[PDB]
Amino acid sequence: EYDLFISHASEDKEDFVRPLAETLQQLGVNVWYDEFTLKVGDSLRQKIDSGLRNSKYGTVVLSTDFIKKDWTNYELDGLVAREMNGHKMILPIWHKITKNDVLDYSPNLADKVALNTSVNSIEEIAHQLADVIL
Amino acid sequence: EYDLFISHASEDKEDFVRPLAETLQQLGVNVWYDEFTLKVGDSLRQKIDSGLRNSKYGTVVLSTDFIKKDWTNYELDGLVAREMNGHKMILPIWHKITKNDVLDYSPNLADKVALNTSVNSIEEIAHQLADVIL
Amino acid sequence: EYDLFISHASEDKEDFVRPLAETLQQLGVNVWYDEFTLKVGDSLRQKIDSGLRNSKYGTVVLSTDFIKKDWTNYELDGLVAREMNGHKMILPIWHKITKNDVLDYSPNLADKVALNTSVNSIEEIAHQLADVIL
Amino acid sequence: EYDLFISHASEDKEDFVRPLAETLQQLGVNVWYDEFTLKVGDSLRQKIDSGLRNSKYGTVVLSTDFIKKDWTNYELDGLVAREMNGHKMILPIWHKITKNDVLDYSPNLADKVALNTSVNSIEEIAHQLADVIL
Ligand SMILES: Nc1cccc2cc[n+]([C@@H]3O[C@H](COP(=O)(O)OP(=O)(O)OC[C@H]4O[C@@H](n5cnc6c(N)ncnc65)[C@H](O)[C@@H]4O)[C@@H](O)[C@H]3O)cc12
Ligand SMILES: Nc1cccc2cc[n+]([C@@H]3O[C@H](COP(=O)(O)OP(=O)(O)OC[C@H]4O[C@@H](n5cnc6c(N)ncnc65)[C@H](O)[C@@H]4O)[C@@H](O)[C@H]3O)cc12
Ligand SMILES: Nc1cccc2cc[n+]([C@@H]3O[C@H](COP(=O)(O)OP(=O)(O)OC[C@H]4O[C@@H](n5cnc6c(N)ncnc65)[C@H](O)[C@@H]4O)[C@@H](O)[C@H]3O)cc12
Ligand SMILES: Nc1cccc2cc[n+]([C@@H]3O[C@H](COP(=O)(O)OP(=O)(O)OC[C@H]4O[C@@H](n5cnc6c(N)ncnc65)[C@H](O)[C@@H]4O)[C@@H](O)[C@H]3O)cc12
Numbered sequence: 309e310y311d312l313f314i315s316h317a318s319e320d321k322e323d324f325v326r327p328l329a330e331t332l333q334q335l336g337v338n339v340w341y342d343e344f345t346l347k348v349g350d351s352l353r354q355k356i357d358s359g360l361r362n363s364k365y366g367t368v369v370l371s372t373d374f375i376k377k378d379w380t381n382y383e384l385d386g387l388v389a390r391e392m393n394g395h396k397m398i399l400p401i402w403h404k405i406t407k408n409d410v411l412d413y414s415p416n417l418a419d420k421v422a423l424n425t426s427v428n429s430i431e432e433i434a435h436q437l438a439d440v441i442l
Numbered sequence: 443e444y445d446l447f448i449s450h451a452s453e454d455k456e457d458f459v460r461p462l463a464e465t466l467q468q469l470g471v472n473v474w475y476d477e478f479t480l481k482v483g484d485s486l487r488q489k490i491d492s493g494l495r496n497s498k499y500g501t502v503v504l505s506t507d508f509i510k511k512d513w514t515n516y517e518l519d520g521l522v523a524r525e526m527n528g529h530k531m532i533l534p535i536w537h538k539i540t541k542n543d544v545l546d547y548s549p550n551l552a553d554k555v556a557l558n559t560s561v562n563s564i565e566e567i568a569h570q571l572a573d574v575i576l
Numbered sequence: 577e578y579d580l581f582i583s584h585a586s587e588d589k590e591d592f593v594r595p596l597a598e599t600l601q602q603l604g605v606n607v608w609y610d611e612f613t614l615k616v617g618d619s620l621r622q623k624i625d626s627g628l629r630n631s632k633y634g635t636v637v638l639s640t641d642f643i644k645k646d647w648t649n650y651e652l653d654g655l656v657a658r659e660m661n662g663h664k665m666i667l668p669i670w671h672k673i674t675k676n677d678v679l680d681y682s683p684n685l686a687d688k689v690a691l692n693t694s695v696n697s698i699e700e701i702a703h704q705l706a707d708v709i710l
Numbered sequence: 711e712y713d714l715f716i717s718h719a720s721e722d723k724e725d726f727v728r729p730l731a732e733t734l735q736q737l738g739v740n741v742w743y744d745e746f747t748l749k750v751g752d753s754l755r756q757k758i759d760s761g762l763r764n765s766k767y768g769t770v771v772l773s774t775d776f777i778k779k780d781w782t783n784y785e786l787d788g789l790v791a792r793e794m795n796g797h798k799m800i801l802p803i804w805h806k807i808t809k810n811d812v813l814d815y816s817p818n819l820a821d822k823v824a825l826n827t828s829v830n831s832i833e834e835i836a837h838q839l840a841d842v843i844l
Contacts, residue, residue, distance in 0.1 A: 485653060486657075487652070487653055487656050487657075488649075488653075491681075491682040491683070491684065494683050494684075495680070495682075495683060512660045512661075512662065513660060516660065516684060519684050519687040520682070520683035520684040520686075520687065521683075522687070523679065523683045523684070523686040523687040524679065524683050524686075527675075527679060
């Protein structure tokens with residue numbers, strides 16, 4: 309069902325991630341985003357697990373807060389596991405972070421071409437993503 | 443697939459290399475150029491290695507910045523390795539650099555005939571390259 | 577902490593890599609090897625990433641099975657990313673493989689001097705490595 | 711640093727070139743020889759280029775196998791390039807080869823005085839070289 313899963317830290321919602329998800333839907337991507345999918349009484353574990361398993365692609369918004377928190381590391385551990393079984397997925401974004409900070413977090417992600425929010429705007433990034441997914 | 447691989451420093455894009463690559467495609471050469479080929483989520487290592495291995499020829503834009511940087515030296519190591527197995531490839535260009543500076547970088551490249559950007563224009567250089575490749 | 581990280585395919589453990597790692601420790605190199613470090617309940621992603629980032633050197637056992645598999649290519653991407661930031665690391669070994677097969681995998685590794693297991697024995701290779709590391 | 715660079719084919723190591731290089735060091739010449747300088751993980755291109763550029767003199771062992779191979783012709787290109795900038799270097803040796811075979815390879819080397827291994831012994835040749843270098 310879903311085309312893209314969005315993994316992000318809650319400190320980045322208002323200035324970046326909410327505008328991004330809203331514009332991707334307007335282009336026509338079917339997106340998994342937590343404010344759209346999770347409802348009262350749902351199991352967090354079981355809903356996240358089935359969202360990770362049923363998405364064609366996943367995007368990760370790398371940030372200083374992303375590195376520290378628990379649920380963000382839970383999601384990225386699951387994306388790499390599915391990619392090491394033969395299915396390529398990960399589309400990275402760099403937000404307020406430099407190459408050296410990424411290379412100190414993991415040197416394998418420093419090998420992957422990312423979109424940098426200090427160089428591209430929100431809609432300029434959204435157009436780049438939809439060209440791969442669609 | 444590709445006819446030519448272009449190896450250059452990013453400081454030289456706007457005043458020389460972007461005009462050159464645009465005019466080569468208009469003559470009909472099938473060219474490997476990083477702004478045309480690399481996309482979000484690609485592995486840099488694995489895409490560059492298959493570009494080097496599947497091209498008939500390679501051109502190197504010698505420059506004061508080309509000498510210092512890392513990825514430029516990575517690409518030239520791979521071109522010489524394939525040439526020392528019996529397949530001639532390299533077509534050199536000298537940009538803002540003199541014979542002495544080239545001879546201090548490597549005396550073997552000082553033996554190979556090159557196109558000098560202080561003597562020829564962009565389209566005059568492009569016409570010279572296509573006569574060898576095509 | 578670690579002096580050397582060993583990257584290898586699991587098909588090569590018993591006739592080559594297990595004897596090699598055992599003899600390197602006896603010479604006194606502090607080595608990262610998966611049978612010594614990984615334990616029940618560890619995250620594979622997070623433990624491999626910190627092993628790559630905290631080692632002075634890395635060795636890669638090039639082999640016909642190494643080229644095909646997923647986790648072997650994951651590790652080599654991270655080594656090259658750290659080397660293209662200015663820190664030299666890679667010490668290559670050729671096992672049951674010829675120059676032509678290496679040049680068809682990547683022409684840049686064909687430029688780097690390697691130890692060939694058809695020419696040198698296990699302890700003769702181990703002595704060569706420790707002279708660089710120590 | 712280096713006084714002499716030795717350029718030779720690997721088919722000639724055991725019966726001529728290893729004894730020669732060992733006796734030159736005993737006289738006190740500082741020599742560039744591949745078995746003494748190159749180590750695991752070195753770039754072949756970048757180490758050879760800095761050896762050619764930092765030596766006062768160069769010697770070439772002309773032989774039937776020398777003429778055919780690739781890396782032997784690579785080194786002689788760089789020596790002539792530096793000599794055509796005004797710095798005399800080349801000290802030739804003829805091994806199992808006649809004047810006619812040299813003249814068919816290049817008529818300019820047939821003009822330079824050479825040492826012939828059918829007329830002089832190893833130590834008799836080594837004494838002749840050191841009188842020029844030292
Ligand atoms: N939508 C969501 C609702 C609830 C929990 C979520 C956890 C994670 N996520 C997923 O993970 C990324 C965010 O990681 P995160 O690390 O930013 O999240 P936090 O841990 O900060 O939690 C955020 C806030 O939920 C409050 N809280 C904690 N347990 C609670 C509970 N049972 N009932 C009510 N409220 C609770 C907690 O008090 C804080 O105010 C996203 O991509 C997303 O897919 C989304 C969540
Ligand atoms: N197109 C390209 C994109 C990304 C990296 C490239 C590296 C090399 N090349 C190849 O090598 C020659 C240029 O050498 P170069 O030495 O000029 O390049 P730089 O190292 O300066 O990198 C240039 C910029 O990429 C930024 N950067 C670094 N890692 C990044 C990452 N994972 N995701 C996003 N951005 C990243 C880095 O912040 C800088 O602003 C060309 O012929 C070409 O074929 C092309 C590249
Ligand atoms: N030590 C190790 C344990 C587990 C997984 C590893 C993966 C990779 N490595 C690293 O990568 C190189 C080897 O690449 P490799 O490609 O040889 O490995 P394989 O994919 O063949 O996995 C080998 C076996 O683990 C079984 N398996 C898969 N997921 C499993 C899981 N969660 N729990 C239990 N067992 C699992 C899988 O069934 C097969 O029998 C080494 O340098 C090393 O640093 C080492 C591993
Ligand atoms: N010391 C040396 C080591 C390696 C390569 C050299 C190349 C050239 N040289 C220089 O050139 C003259 C000799 O020309 P040459 O033409 O005699 O040499 P070959 O091409 O026959 O190579 C000889 C052997 O290296 C094996 N081979 C090829 N690539 C390899 C690689 N990455 N890692 C491991 N082994 C590799 C290849 O399998 C063969 O067995 C000398 O004056 C010297 O300064 C010296 C070399």
